[PDB]
């Protein structure tokens with residue numbers, strides 16, 4: 001379990017919290033991130049195994065992607081997301097087709113690496129009010145590229161299934 005806590009301390013100060021769809025989150029000054037085996041808000045998720053990635057895609061990703069904790073990557077984003085019942089009712093082949101064949105989530109995002117490093121956390125199965133916690137780190141000079149990527153994905157068929165989403169932006173403290 002990785003716990004994201006909006007509060008008065010932590011490795012990240014919070015630049016901004018803005019609504020995207022559905023209910024937003026309360027303001028806080030800092031974000032702490034920490035492992036755990038079990039305040040304005042607190043959110044938890046789990047880094048997990050691949051649900052959609054195929055081998056050729058994994059190869060393509062690992063060849064360009066960067067890791068967390070880069071000295072220059074002093075800006076970050078946390079985007080909590082919940083998809084609709086209609087999404088979760090669909091079968092695996094139908095979700096994969098929307099995710100990649102129609103939305104090209106992977107193929108269209110590859111150009112943004114290595115600039116944008118990412119980590120995905122899953123939390124539907126632990127009863128959290130979101131389904132995913134998406135975490136991104138980048139240099140200040142790539143922030144406009146980052147907001148551009150985000151706007152691109154938010155225009156996709158995949159995103160028509162998002163029913164709650166919040167925009168949190170951070171600066172390394």
Ligand code: HEM
Nearest residue numbers: 049050051052053079081106109110112116118132134150
């Ligand atoms: C920076 C470039 C990005 C790349 C290379 C990328 C790549 C991926 C990959 C390969 C997966 C699937 C993991 C799996 O097989 O389970 C994924 C899942 C996901 N990504 Fe992205 N992503 C990027 C940016 C973003 C952004 C900016 C967001 C949110 C605004 C986002 C939201 C998500 C979500 C919610 C999932 C889970 C999809 C699901 O399982 O229903 N990604 N991403």
